[PDB]
Design a protein around this ligand. Structure first.
Ligand SMILES: Cc1cc2c3c(c1C)C(C)(C)CC=[N+]3c1c([nH]c(=O)[nH]c1=O)N2C[C@H](O)[C@H](O)[C@H](O)COP(=O)(O)O
Ligand SMILES: Cc1cc2c3c(c1C)C(C)(C)CC=[N+]3c1c([nH]c(=O)[nH]c1=O)N2C[C@H](O)[C@H](O)[C@H](O)COP(=O)(O)O
Ligand SMILES: [Mn+2]
Ligand SMILES: [Mn+2]
Ligand code: NA
Ligand code: NA
Lengths: 488, 488
């Protein structure tokens, strides 16, 4: 029974290949991410790279007693194990959880291991940059980063409305972090409201969590509208409410069984340049695989306290690579699957938020045409996907005999089940995502501004009338195990 | 306080222009529809036609004491009057209704005006064809029709789940009607379960109702999925549970305040050709404005009793014209508005399921670009509309300074705010609707079968960067009343 990060690690150690440790000292500045690039980053990371074990660095140069874990979610197979289902059924499993959330509950401090140690920021010797290692991804990052900082915040007009979101946080001072909030983010709604009143917004930053919590948090509207506390998704995944705890220094709740907690306040009026201390002009790598530019004006979090377990693990990521694919892609699949199943019951067999799009840009939809009237519904399913997840860019439609998690098999369907002047539909001028650098007026005259795209639907499903001609060569059903037991 | 059809009529008489009566004899065979075609049929009806008053024919040739009402819903303004809001806010008023239904409530027979007269079909002289004047729309109809028959059935395995749907009913014998159910209709799921067990399914047909009941019943999935009693959308429009009565001859409930009830059972194994007595080859006019073909195999309702008020009004429609536009269009609008508001809050201003598409084929979306990032979201709204209502064919996008209910102003936006090689996106091969005769491989080589279409998005919104050049010419704001008092 997993209810925190260390019960999750215990599970991975029962499945060898999924978790390793090392005691060889590593520099959290750039070197750590450089090592894991070769070992488990995966995703859109610059080659050479691969998926591998989640990796724990026990010896962190400059931070004795600290230990850093990366890659916990950097594998679809690892994610399915931690959630307790088969990887091919994640879309259905996560889809049902978001439809039936279990609300979190408050517990006293006695059942909050996150509060075994309390460090107040008003101590003259407190220094966030000395207390926790904040690893960087590239040598040209804006500064030390926390990349799995699950921020928890509430509406200042109604404290029953809580939202939880991962945002990148750069360590700027002994007691300040910069926080990037994209436009339209739900916590940003809370922040703009507090700043409009000239008041700070209390926040907790929760790091080192049950993988169900990180995954469950990464939903967006309309699947989780404004007001939907995404912690309910984790509660449904575990059939156990997430436990919240009162922070020690801010008027906001914290995740009781987290490893590390930073309590702080979003200051009104204050803005800071993300790379003020390095002037690299860059923030950190983004999920499409390119380096993001430093943000010139970010709100800052004034740290009030840091609150940890004993021998606490600092969990972060590298790439963000395959870890981002899992965190964003599983909700993307769940959101799409729920929408298509509601509109066209029984039609959609599966969906893959492909790692080549970081779990956001590329959707592979697996459909099964059961009757003549299903012809023409494959394009409807693509439209539903595009309408459900506006940050999608391209859709590839395939039949139930194509393995959507095998990119070779996807390209096969694009080769023998596609005619370029028949099967490709382009939709110009649709708002997409700022971090796709090809979504620029410089790339296409049909793009009026940054983050607008042509979106393309590749229909690689066999036309209904031709299905008897496109049967894949049938090989005899055998159990191969007796001829090579070692390989099974 | 409107609880039924007579109270609804009473309100219309307080608004001159919306209700008229005639004592000049009329033949319910073809001639009645021929007259109302000129008076208020509207919609896709072949010109000359118009919207006008709801019309009560008090002298029905061959049926003394009967009186036929048509056109009750054949006007958006009249529907707005009957529901108590302004016509521009029906999309929002009905949208909030479907998302807050109020379940119906059972009532004893002493409070059921529908049962003031009872005619059991086991009487030797009972003849449905002499008892009620079921009018025909065209001389080539399959036979006499009831076109506002709200059929009420339930799951034979779960009595708790009840569905209500308008279906065209053709009087075939003295105690029999045929009923057409399209593929995947929700009541068809109940009948197929009944027929597969060799059991009849008891049903009640409710005619002459509060307009709120007819309108709220015409929703479709995924807005009102399978298992959603459409009764209660009416309950939300009236803030009043509609009242039910236990049937006098079948194990099913009827709407207590209806004008006429027909109690019957869908018979297992039996099928009839819809035009068996006419051999015209046609059923009746469909909502796109063409003649539907006679269905060769339809289930049969065996009438067990007919139950009606004193001086019962037979309510039906003609065209189906604008009456269908209202019944189908306002659920269409509510569904699209709810979906876009969930996905892009504040962006969509209004939506019109245009009468030229019968309330189903043509969607006019009125958006307001508020900021640079709203450029590219107009196409996203169009995708959401097409994903939400799969029977849509075309989308026209316009700004908030275009009156989407004025077809001249729509064509204006298509003339000065569109370039043909920029603003038009075509999506070939998407399933649409069988009753669009242009959705045929004979019309286009990209159409693989009947009811598949190219779907087209006309972006007639001003590009964000150009909005200052497209301001409509402003006139001094005056009160014109003193210069033309009689014109109000
Ligand atoms: C998984 C993930 C999501 C990040 C993210 C990261 C990851 C790993 C980082 C740490 C690698 C770097 C950037 N992140 C940010 C972010 N959203 C945002 O506004 N600012 C961010 O800095 N997101 C996206 C955000 O978490 C998702 O879009 C949420 O679904 C938004 O939820 P909301 O609707 O509640 O606001
Ligand atoms: C408003 C309206 C809807 C008709 C209709 C008519 C009208 C006036 C008529 C009476 C003029 C002619 C045909 N009707 C039929 C029809 N659907 C159907 O399956 N058979 C029909 O005969 N419909 C469509 C159907 O009622 C709607 O699509 C419902 O939303 C379906 O509801 P459901 O999902 O619960 O089955
Ligand atoms: Mn949210
Ligand atoms: Mn229904
Ligand atoms: Na969130
Ligand atoms: Na229905």
């Amino acid at each position: 029974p997993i209810n925190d990060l260390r019960s999750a690690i215990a599970l991975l150690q029962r499945h060898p290949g999924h978790y390793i440790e090392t005691d060889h000292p590593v520099d959290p500045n750039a070197e750590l991410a450089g090592v894991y690039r070769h070992i488990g980053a995966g995703g859109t990371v610059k080659r050479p790279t691969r998926t591998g074990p989640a990796m724990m660095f026990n010896s962190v140069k400059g931070y004795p007693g600290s230990r850093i874990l990366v890659g916990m979610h950097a594998s679809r197979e690892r994610a399915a194990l931690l959630l307790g289902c088969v990887p091919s059924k994640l879309a259905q499993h996560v889809g049902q959880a978001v439809k039936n959330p279990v609300a979190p509950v408050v517990v006293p401090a006695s059942q909050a291991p996150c509060q075994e140690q309390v460090f107040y920021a008003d101590d003259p010797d407190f220094d966030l940059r000395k207390l926790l290692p904040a690893p960087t991804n590239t040598p040209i990052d804006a500064g030390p980063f926390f990349c799995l900082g699950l921020v928890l915040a509430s509406d200042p007009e109604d404290t029953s409305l809580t939202d939880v979101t991962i945002h990148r946080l750069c360590v700027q001072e002994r007691d300040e972090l910069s926080m990037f909030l994209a436009a339209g983010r739900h916590i940003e709604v809370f922040r703009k409201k507090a700043e409009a009143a000239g008041k700070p917004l209390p926040v907790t930053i929760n790091m080192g969590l049950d993988p169900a919590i990180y995954i469950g948090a990464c939903f967006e509207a309309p699947t989780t509208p404004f007001g939907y506390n995404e912690l309910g998704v984790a509660g449904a995944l575990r059939q156990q409410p997430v436990e919240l705890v009162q922070g020690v220094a801010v008027k906001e709740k914290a995740i009781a069984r987290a490893e590390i907690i930073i309590e702080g306040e979003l200051l009104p009026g204050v803005r800071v340049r993300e790379d003020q201390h390095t002037n690299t002009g860059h923030a950190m790598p983004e999920f499409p695989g390119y380096c993001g530019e430093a943000n010139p004006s970010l709100p800052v979090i004034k740290v009030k306290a840091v609150t940890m377990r004993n021998h606490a693990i600092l969990q972060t990521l590298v790439g963000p690579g395959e870890e981002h694919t899992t965190l964003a892609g599983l909700p993307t699949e769940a959101s799409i699957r729920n929408a298509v199943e509601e509109a066209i019951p029984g039609f959609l067999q599966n969906v893959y938020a492909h790692t080549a799009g970081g779990g956001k840009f590329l959707g592979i939809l697996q459909v099964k045409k059961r009757q003549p009237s299903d012809e023409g519904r494959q394009g409807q399913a693509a439209l539903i996907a595009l309408a459900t997840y506006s940050e999608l860019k391209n859709i590839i439609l395939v039949d139930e005999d194509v393995d959507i998690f095998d990119s070779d098999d996807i390209l096969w369907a694009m080769t023998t089940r596609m005619q370029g002047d028949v099967s490709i539909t382009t939709l110009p001028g649709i708002r997409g995502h700022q971090l796709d650098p090809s979504q620029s007026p410089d790339y296409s005259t049909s793009i009026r501004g940054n983050g607008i795209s042509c979106k393309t639907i590749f229909d690689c499903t066999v036309p209904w009338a031709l299905k008897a001609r496109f049967e894949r060569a049938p090989f005899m059903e055998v159990d191969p195990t007796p001829w090579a037991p070692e390989l099974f």
